[PDB]
Amino acid sequence: KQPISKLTRATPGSAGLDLCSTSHTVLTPEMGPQALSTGIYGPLPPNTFGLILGRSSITMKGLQVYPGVIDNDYTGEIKIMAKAVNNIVTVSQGNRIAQLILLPLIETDNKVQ
Amino acid sequence: KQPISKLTRATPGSAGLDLCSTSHTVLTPEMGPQALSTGIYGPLPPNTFGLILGRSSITMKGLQVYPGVIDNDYTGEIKIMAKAVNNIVTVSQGNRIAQLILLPLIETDNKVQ
Amino acid sequence: KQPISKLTRATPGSAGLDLCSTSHTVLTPEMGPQALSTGIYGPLPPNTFGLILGRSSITMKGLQVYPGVIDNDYTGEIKIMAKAVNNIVTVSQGNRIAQLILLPLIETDNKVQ
Ligand SMILES: O=c1ccn([C@H]2C[C@H](O)[C@@H](COP(=O)(O)NP(=O)(O)OP(=O)(O)O)O2)c(=O)[nH]1
Ligand SMILES: O=c1ccn([C@H]2C[C@H](O)[C@@H](COP(=O)(O)NP(=O)(O)OP(=O)(O)O)O2)c(=O)[nH]1
Ligand SMILES: O=c1ccn([C@H]2C[C@H](O)[C@@H](COP(=O)(O)NP(=O)(O)OP(=O)(O)O)O2)c(=O)[nH]1
Ligand SMILES: [Mg+2]
Ligand SMILES: [Mg+2]
Ligand SMILES: [Mg+2]
Numbered sequence: 001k002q003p004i005s006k007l008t009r010a011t012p013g014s015a016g017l018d019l020c021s022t023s024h025t026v027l028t029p030e031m032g033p034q035a036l037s038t039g040i041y042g043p044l045p046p047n048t049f050g051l052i053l054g055r056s057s058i059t060m061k062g063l064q065v066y067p068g069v070i071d072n073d074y075t076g077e078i079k080i081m082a083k084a085v086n087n088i089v090t091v092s093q094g095n096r097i098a099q100l101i102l103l104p105l106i107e108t109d110n111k112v113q
Numbered sequence: 114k115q116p117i118s119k120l121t122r123a124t125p126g127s128a129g130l131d132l133c134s135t136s137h138t139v140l141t142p143e144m145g146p147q148a149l150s151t152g153i154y155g156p157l158p159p160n161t162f163g164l165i166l167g168r169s170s171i172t173m174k175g176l177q178v179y180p181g182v183i184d185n186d187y188t189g190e191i192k193i194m195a196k197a198v199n200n201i202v203t204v205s206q207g208n209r210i211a212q213l214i215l216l217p218l219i220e221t222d223n224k225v226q
Numbered sequence: 227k228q229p230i231s232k233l234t235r236a237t238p239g240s241a242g243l244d245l246c247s248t249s250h251t252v253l254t255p256e257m258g259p260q261a262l263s264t265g266i267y268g269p270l271p272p273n274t275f276g277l278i279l280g281r282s283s284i285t286m287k288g289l290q291v292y293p294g295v296i297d298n299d300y301t302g303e304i305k306i307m308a309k310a311v312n313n314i315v316t317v318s319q320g321n322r323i324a325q326l327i328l329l330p331l332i333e334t335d336n337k338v339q
Contacts, residue, residue, distance in 0.1 A: 009338045013299030015275035015331055032199040033173050048332065049128035049214075051166075053277075059292050059307050060259050066172050067180055067293055069212060073126030081172050083198065085309065086258040099295060101275075102332045105128055106161065106215045112122045145312040146286050162241035162327075164279075179285050180293055182325060186239030194285050196311065218241055219274065219328045225235045 002040050004050075004078075007100065016053065016099025019080060025091045027084035033066065035079040036097065042074035049105045052080060052098050063089045065098045072105055115153050117163075117191075120213065129166065129212025132193060138204045140197035146179065148192040149210065155187035162218045165193060165211050176202045178211045185218055228266050230276075230304075233326065242279065242325025245306060251317045253310035259292065261305040262323065268300035275331045278306060278324050289315045291324045298331055 007017035021036045044050055050070030054063070066081040080098040082091075091097055120130035134149045157163055163183030167176070179194040193211040195204075204210055233243035247262045270276055276296030280289070292307040306324040308317075317323055 005334075005336065007336055009336055011297065011299060012338050013269075013275075013331075014297050014338075015295050015329075016297075017334075017336055030199065032175055035173060043126075045332075045334065049126075053293055053295055056294055056307060059294075060261060062258055064292065066177065067166055068169055068172075069128050069166055069214065071124065071127050071129075073124060081169060086256065101295065101329075102334065103128075103214075104217060104330060104332070105126075106158075106217070108118075108130075108158065108215065110118065110120055110122055110130055112125050112127075143312065145288055148286060156239075162239075179290065180279055181282055181285075182241050182279055182327065184237065184240050184242075186237060194282060216241075216327075217330060218239075219271075219330070221231075221243075221271065221328065223231065223233055223235055223243055225238050225240075 018096040019098040021091045024093045027089045038078045040078045048102045051101045062087050131209040132211040134204045137206045140202045151191045153191045161215045164214045175200050244322040245324040247317045250319045253315045264304045266304045274328045277327045288313050
């Protein structure tokens with residue numbers, strides 16, 4: 001069980017923190033959305049929230065990551081919502097399949113609940 | 114006809130403002146993208162713009178929300194662009210089906226028009 | 227070969243910088259994800275990164291743009307990852323098919339590599 005601080009960037013100017021799948025998983029289009037486990041857990045740095053996005057090279061290989069919001073105070077496991085687009089997709093354990101982007105969390109006076 | 118300030122957050126640390134559908138709508142994959150009405154209207158707080166994203170629990174139930182940009186000065190109704198992925202999806206009136214995230218709008222010297 | 231500074235906004239309050247396709251391209255659902263060329267190149271302004279998103283009017287016409295991350299220091303050509311959802315889609319040369327959003331790039335102590 002690892003915190004976000006254990007993630008790595010591909011390059012200093014890379015916006016994304018790479019996320020791997022902890023299981024070998026096979027996906028087909030008729031399966032629809034599947035939640036892949038990452039072994040990485042929230043919460044995020046103060047005043048930030050997260051967006052999970054696909055890696056372009058993975059998207060182009062037929063695995064669609066659906067954009068997901070990670071709330072600042074989420075303490076569960078970060079999962080990747082993914083679907084094979086057209087073809088059979090095989091995700092091996094340790095393949096980097098998504099990236100976490102950190103964004104400023106803006107305060108508003110919207111009521112909470 | 115309601116402003117964004119009428120939206121609520123699920124929790125203090127929730128990044129998203131929840132959006133409901135004001136109509137009962139049935140969606141099938143062969144329908145392609147449909148724009149669902151929310152009864153909520155722009156514009157946004159100064160120096161901000163919006164992103165519409167799916168709720169994870171809704172995505173996992175087979176309703177794909179396509180990420181949408183809400184411009185700072187948009188004064189129309191916020192619509193959710195959505196598609197049933199694999200199966201028949203029934204949206205009831207009042208179901209929260211998307212979330213609005215607020216982001217900083219960066220100024221640049223790009224020409225306007 | 228053009229820099230991001232050559233892009234235009236539709237309106238002063240438009241969050242997105244519009245991206246065109248430099249080729250006439252036909253897309254069908256069975257083709258899966260295709261990378262469309264824009265003739266626009268990174269890198270981005272300092273302390274920023276990019277997100278490529280669909281235009282709503284294009285999404286509603288059946289062309290799905292998959293959200294893409296443009297890293298701050300990317301110096302290659304910005305491509306649009308796109309898929310025809312349900313129907314045959316014809317992209318003409320010069321049609322604006324996506325938009326680039328600029329976001330703050332947050333520094334963290336995550337290891338780089
Ligand atoms: O891709 C994702 C999306 C969300 N999550 C987690 C983190 C996020 O804080 C949490 C809640 O997600 P959303 O608000 O998008 N989901 P939903 O509105 O269905 O649940 P809730 O009512 O708890 O907010 O689910 C992931 O692990 N992966
Ligand atoms: O999911 C969305 C996306 C956009 N919208 C509205 C708000 C946004 O400001 C407006 C314009 O959207 P985009 O720029 O993405 N659309 P497009 O480029 O086709 O139209 P325009 O030329 O007016 O900018 O449409 C929604 O209500 N829901
Ligand atoms: O839609 C996109 C997405 C990315 N790109 C370019 C810019 C981005 O900096 C670069 C790398 O994209 P990602 O990190 O999402 N891709 P991936 O992780 O597969 O490659 P890398 O290992 O180089 O980071 O590809 C586009 O031109 N269009
Ligand atoms: Mg990458
Ligand atoms: Mg939520
Ligand atoms: Mg536009």
